């Protein structure tokens, strides 16, 4: 059984250097033709190939990132390290390392190369956020008018934040959207709820950003 | 470099259907192509390697065929765990490219979004910023287009949106879009409008308000 796992800092600031480690078990980077590669996935986006290294020590890099990447292996520790320099916000992504089989051998003779055509086992992935921001609690504003209302949880860092309605009693019609990382480096999210245009019943969003010790309850109503 | 185009980018289906996803390469990649299935929150999982070989432990309903520039993955009888995003990967040329992915979600009848526009709170305005949010609630299919207009000027580069995951008991999606402006710019205009295009709407719907109107 082959398993891989990524480790490194969850948060990194722009211009800094990011070092990610892939520790694995079940194979050796001294086994014939084996490879270990790195692939990343920005939130909501497609997979993007970064680099790969083989047991004979050949290395290859994405041409778009070549100047900022270094991949290396430590055979005796069963680890592969990928160093990315000068990171910027667009480098925020989940980073995965993965195993690539070498050709099948028969009495130590390569006879099948079809198994090298895939990355067959992946690590769970490690989420890395690139922002110069310091920890900060959200400002909570009302979103007022089925009828809809909500709360705009603005300018906080880092993730996550929790939002519920009426201390947890209101669930039907609730939609809490995934936060977006603003160009400022702070997150922002909305949480809304739809109700029969008659219920306008009271509505209060309970917001909690553990990182900054910030709890807020904001009752929202139909203005005027 | 080499381009891998998946089709369709998104696809709706029901348990028991047969679906086929295709991937086309800009130059021939021989048989060096792999297919993966990735469920939300998890890493991609290898289904098919070398264009058509079934990966060990992968269920037989998955099948891959093709070579050169055109490949297809077909799932013969869709199971609930197959509602996910699929990717193809080429390994013939460096860099080892991935396709754009194809999202497979629960089919349901077309439903237009209920649209709502929210002006910025007076509380936010006092801090100097103005957020205008537009909500598209419970629609299907997933593709929707939101266009902000201020005093008829088309807005660009000053909004952000996010979409919920498919609802497990509606099968619909919801979308939130935030237009952000300084309090000053905000004050220099009247009509704030959120224009929405969607398959379930027989023409674009616009929700708006005039700033300061009381």
């Amino acid at each position: 059984r082959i398993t891989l796992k990524e480790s490194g800092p969850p948060l990194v600031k722009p211009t800094q250097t990011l070092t990610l480690t892939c520790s694995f078990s079940g194979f050796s980077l001294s086994d014939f033709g084996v490879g270990v590669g790195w692939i990343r996935q920005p939130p909501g986006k497609a997979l993007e190939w970064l680099a790969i290294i083989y047991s004979d020590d050949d290395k290859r890099y994405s041409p778009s990132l070549n100047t900022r990447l270094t991949i290396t292996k430590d055979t005796s520790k069963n680890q592969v390290v990928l160093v990315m320099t000068r990171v910027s916000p667009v480098d925020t992504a989940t980073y995965f390392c993965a195993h690539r089989r070498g050709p099948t051998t028969l009495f130590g003779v390569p006879i099948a190369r079809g198994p090298v055509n895939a990355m067959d086992v992946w690590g769970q992935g490690i989420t890395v956020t690139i922002s110069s921001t310091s920890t900060k609690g959200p400002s909570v504003f009302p979103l007022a008018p089925a009828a809809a209302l909500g709360c705009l949880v603005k300018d906080y860092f880092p993730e996550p934040v929790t939002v519920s309605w009426n201390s947890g009693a209101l669930t039907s019609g609730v939609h809490t959207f995934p936060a977006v990382l603003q160009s400022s480096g702070l997150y922002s999210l909305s949480s809304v709820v739809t109700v029969p245009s008659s219920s306008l019943q009271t509505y209060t969003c309970n917001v909690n950003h553990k990182p900054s010790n910030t709890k807020v309850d904001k009752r929202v109503e139909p203005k005027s | 470099a080499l381009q891998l185009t998946q089709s369709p980018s998104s696809l709706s289906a029901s348990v028991g259907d047969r679906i086929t996803i295709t991937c086309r390469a800009s130059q021939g990649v021989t048989s060096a192509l792999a297919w993966y299935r990735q469920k939300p929150g998890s890493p991609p999982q290898l289904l098919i390697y070398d264009a058509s070989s079934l990966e060990s432990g992968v269920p037989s309903r998955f099948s891959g065929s093709g070579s050169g520039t055109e490949f297809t993955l077909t799932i013969s009888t869709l199971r609930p765990e197959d509602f996910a995003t699929y990717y193809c990967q080429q390994l013939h040329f460096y860099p080892h490219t991935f396709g754009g992915g194809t999202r497979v979600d629960v089919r349901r009848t077309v439903a237009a979004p209920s649209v709502f526009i929210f002006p910025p709170s007076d509380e936010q305005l006092k801090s100097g910023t103005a957020s205008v949010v537009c909500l598209l609630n419970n629609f299907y299919p997933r593709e929707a287009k939101v266009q902000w207009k201020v005093d008829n000027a088309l807005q660009s580069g000053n909004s952000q949106e996010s979409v919920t995951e498919q609802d497990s008991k509606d099968s619909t999606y919801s979308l939130s879009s935030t237009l952000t402006l300084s309090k000053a710019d905000y004050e220099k205009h009247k009509v704030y409008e959120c224009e929405v295009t969607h398959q379930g709407l027989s023409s674009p719907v616009t929700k708006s308000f005039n700033r300061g109107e009381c």
Binding site: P103 | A32, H92, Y94, H96
Partner: peptide, 7 residues
């Protein structure tokens, strides 16, 4: 360029 296992 050409992958490791080409030819």
């Amino acid at each position: 360029e050409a992958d490791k296992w080409q030819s």
